[PDB]
Design a protein around this ligand. Structure first.
Ligand SMILES: [Ca+2]
Length: 297
C-alpha cells in the first residue's frame, strides 16, 4: 500500500521503472529483529572507565597498526589530499567495524525497508535513506540486494549511511567504482573526504587535559557536544589547560583513576559529527594517538 506509494514516487520523481522496483520489493523482507533493536530502552550508563577499554585494547591497537602497515601509501595519500591525519582515518575504521570484522549482519534493503515502512517514530528519516540507497545502487550499477549494513542501514568499513555515501564517499583508487565494503582504499579516502567536508582544520589540536579551581567551575561543563563559549571564557570560569579565541567544549569524565577534565577544540567537535557522543570522540582521538605512537608517526 504505502510501498506502492513509495514506488510511485520513485517512478514519477526519480525515473525508476515501476516494474523493476516492484520485483525488487517482492524480494525484500520485514525483519522483526531490526524493529526490536531500534526499539531498545537506554542502556545502563557506562563511565569513561568502562567505555574506554572497549575501544583502547591490545587487539584493537594491534589490528590498527596492521591495517596501517598494509595501507600505508593510501593513508599517506589521503592525509596529503584531504589534510586529515592518517591515524584519525584508521581509528574511525577501527571503532566502527574493527577494520572490517563487524560490518553489519543485514541486507541494507531489508533494514531500510523495515524501518522506512514499519517504524513510525523515524519512518521519514529511513524512507529518505531508502531512496538515497536506491539512487547510489543505480549510480554504482550494482544489485541493490547485494549490499550489507547494520540494522540501521550503515554500510561497509566506515559504516556510512546511504545519504553520506552519496554526499561524501569517493573512488580513491581510480577504478570507476566506489566500494566502501571490500575496498579499503575507497574506505580510507571516503573517511578523509567526510572529515574535510565537516570542517576538520589541518594541523590544529583536538583536545587538551584540564584541571579546575573550584566546584563552581563544574557549572561550565557542556551539556551535549555543542560549544557555547570561547576557550578564554572557559578559562575565566576556572579551567586551566592554545588560542583563546576558539569555541570549545568542556568535559568531566569518570576515568580509571578518578575524575578527568578535558577541553574539546573545534576538531573534537568535527569528530562528534560522526557520532554525537563526547566519549565516542575521545575514544576515536585516543585510539588514533595510540596507533600513531605504535607506528612511530
Ligand atoms: Ca574505487
Amino acid at each position: 500500500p504505502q510501498v506502492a506509494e513509495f514506488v510511485s514516487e520513485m517512478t514519477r520523481d526519480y525515473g525508476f521503472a515501476g516494474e523493476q522496483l516492484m520485483g525488487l520489493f517482492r524480494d525484500v523482507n520485514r525483519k522483526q529483529s531490526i524493529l526490536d533493536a531500534i526499539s531498545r530502552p537506554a542502556e545502563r550508563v557506562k563511565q569513561w572507565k568502562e567505555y574506554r577499554p572497549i575501544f583502547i585494547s591490545d587487539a584493537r591497537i594491534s589490528r590498527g597498526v596492521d591495517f596501517w602497515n598494509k595501507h600505508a601509501e593510501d593513508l599517506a595519500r589521503a592525509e596529503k589530499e584531504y589534510g586529515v591525519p592518517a591515524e584519525i582515518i584508521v581509528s574511525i575504521i577501527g571503532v566502527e567495524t574493527f577494520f572490517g570484522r563487524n560490518t553489519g549482519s543485514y541486507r541494507v534493503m531489508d533494514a531500510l525497508s523495515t524501518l522506512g515502512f514499519d517504524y513510525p517514530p523515524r519512518a521519514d528519516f529511513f524512507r529518505k535513506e531508502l531512496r538515497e540507497f536506491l539512487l547510489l545502487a543505480r549510480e554504482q550499477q550494482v544489485d541493490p540486494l547485494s549490499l550489507t549494513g547494520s540494522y540501521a542501514g550503515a554500510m561497509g568499513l566506515p559504516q556510512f549511511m546511504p545519504s553520506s555515501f552519496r554526499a561524501y564517499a569517493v573512488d580513491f583508487d581510480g577504478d570507476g567504482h566506489i566500494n566502501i565494503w571490500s575496498d579499503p582504499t575507497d574506505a580510507i579516502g571516503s573517511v578523509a573526504s567526510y572529515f574535510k567536508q565537516h570542517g576538520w582544520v589541518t594541523g590544529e589540536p583536538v583536545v587538551s587535559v584540564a584541571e579546575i579551581n573550584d566546584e563552581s567551575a563544574e557549572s561550565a561543563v557542556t551539556r551535549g557536544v555543542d560549544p557555547t563559549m570561547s576557550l578564554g571564557e572557559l578559562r575565566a570560569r576556572g579551567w586551566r589547560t592554545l588560542r583563546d579565541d576558539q569555541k570549545v567544549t568542556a568535559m568531566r569524565f569518570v576515568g580509571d583513576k578518578g575524575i578527568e577534565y578535558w577541553v574539546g577544540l573545534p576538531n573534537f567537535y568535527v569528530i562528534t559529527r560522526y557520532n554525537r557522543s563526547a566519549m565516542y570522540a575521545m575514544a576515536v582521538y585516543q585510539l588514533a594517538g595510540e596507533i600513531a605512537r605504535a607506528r612511530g608517526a
